[PDB]
Design a protein around this ligand. Structure first.
Ligand SMILES: [Mg+2]
Ligand SMILES: [Mg+2]
Lengths: 296, 296
DNA sequence: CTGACGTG
DNA sequence: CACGTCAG
DNA sequence: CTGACGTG
DNA sequence: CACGTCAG
């Protein structure tokens, strides 16, 4: 009798795509969590975000979907939780990361800077671990005022009132190999949704997993054996993001992956040379292999 | 192998009790929705809330539970979504309504005044409809600031950061009889979590079901056929709360039975007459009986 | 790599 | 809106 | 009815 | 804390 006309629906079921899964927040119009698994093969290939378009997820009821009109002109950028750069292997997978079900309102500088560098480090880990799992998502955390009152405040944007998070979180779980007798590596990080420089190290944003679960109301990787050997990812690995020089270099390399015209190449080396940087052996070895191909 | 260690858990599964069900919000430490079914029989009985105590729900993971320490001294009252008064028929059901999984931080005046009167009206509906279903819960809505920005802002209380809602909602669905071909009657209401006098009629807080679903991120009564004719409950019924005199007389009537001394009983009568409220014959019967017993 | 912005 | 251009 | 508080 | 007392 109680359930004669059904229980209310919260819409939090896991939604699976080609190379990520998420749970959606219908009230805030953003994901609660986005889970991915990266390996060196996934991050290679010819998929190109220039052929992709942000758009509502066709599997989300339109009443609870965000739309591009919510974001454009808002002063907030569209920030993908599963990044396009993790899906070079499949045009379909990359396009599915442009569904707004994967997007939160993100500070432009953060999206293009510190958070970008965290994503780059997650990819770097596949050079050292066979398997890497990442859960990313938004948070709206309280601030404590001087009188002890704790208050959650956040902006909502657009006709659809899309929630702008105060912070973003990432949980990284890395397994060296399938046969490894070695412990798993785990780290949880919470970063404010704002411009962050190159000075603060990633460890300054590290939190215990239990604290993140309390803050987010989520349980991550719930099948994990609690007596298994898990260590702090920042003690068995570096947790070292790219510095300015290496970040500018990396970006330039990503740009030599692409080739459109000569004068473009000119502008590239122009801005790069205004900041010195001696091309290290890697960017050179990757410079000739492409230069030859292009003049061919 | 993306799900190697399981998907993250959000904890929103429906939880069923003797005479209500709820979905719990582990981040805010309050229910998202509480569903109940009321009839003539369930609101009769000897269940007494003086035998009950607010306590954590033993089925909620302690990590995500509220505790009484979060509420005591906070300035906010414990506000039940499924009310004790709907569970006079069963001491077990009543006890379960005092689990903190059914509780939100509620303005004291609102809890004991306007919201109390809405609850009373839900019970009144069982005099004219055989079956009444009600979904109740908290809401944290934005305000539009002077500069046009829309901001959500709410307090979180206690060491567990229990979220204080800005508003409370109720959806009421009423069915005349199980075999009747009369359309069902439905209403949705959104009330601010603050003191509300006797002046505003309940219809001033009515909203369309669609608007409440968009604001709450929920779909209510998903098995209700919305394409068949459904009546506005404030059209087919009264949506009239008890007015000051009726409310005060009802409260005084219930206070008669609790009075422990002649002083307190007599002061109940004095307050009534001081406000120019006339007692009714039933009230004077109970009052004279109790007064005789306490004097003796 | 991460995106928005201005012209059609 | 598309799409080239620009920017961190 | 709805609740918070003060004492063995 | 459990209980009795008090207030909206
Ligand atoms: Mg991004
Ligand atoms: Mg109440």
């Amino acid at each position: 009798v109680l359930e004669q006309f059904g229980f209310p629906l919260t819409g939090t079921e896991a939604r699976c795509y080609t190379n990520h899964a998420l749970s959606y927040d219908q009230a805030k119009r953003v994901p609660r969590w986005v889970l991915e698994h990266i390996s060196k093969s996934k991050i290679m290939g010819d998929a190109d975000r220039k052929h992709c378009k942000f758009k509502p997820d066709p599997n989300i009821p339109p009443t609870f979907s965000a739309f591009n009109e919510d974001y454009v002109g808002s002063g907030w950028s569209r920030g993908a939780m599963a990044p396009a750069g993790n899906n070079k292997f499949s045009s379909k997978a990359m396009a599915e990361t442009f569904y707004l079900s994967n997007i939160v309102p993100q500070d432009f500088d953060n999206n293009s800077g510190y958070w970008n560098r965290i994503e780059m480090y997650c990819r770097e880990l596949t050079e050292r671990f066979e398997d890497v799992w990442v859960v990313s998502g938004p948070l709206t955390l309280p601030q404590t005022r001087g009188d002890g009152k704790k208050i959650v405040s956040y902006q909502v944007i657009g006709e659809d009132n899309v929630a702008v998070p105060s912070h973003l979180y990432k949980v990284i779980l890395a397994r060296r190999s399938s046969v490894s007798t070695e412990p798993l590596a785990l780290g949880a990080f919470v970063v404010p949704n704002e411009a962050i420089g190159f000075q603060p190290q990633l460890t300054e944003f590290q939190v215990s997993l239990q604290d993140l679960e309390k803050l987010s109301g989520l349980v991550f990787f719930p099948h994990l054996d609690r007596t298994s050997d898990i260590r702090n990812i920042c003690s068995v690995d570096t947790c070292k993001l790219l510095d300015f020089q290496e970040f500018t270099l990396y970006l330039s390399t990503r740009k030599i992956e692409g080739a459109r015209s000569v004068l473009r190449l000119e502008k590239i080396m122009e801005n790069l040379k205004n900041a010195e940087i001696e091309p290290d052996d890697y960017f050179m070895s990757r410079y000739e292999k492409k230069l030859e191909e292009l003049k061919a």
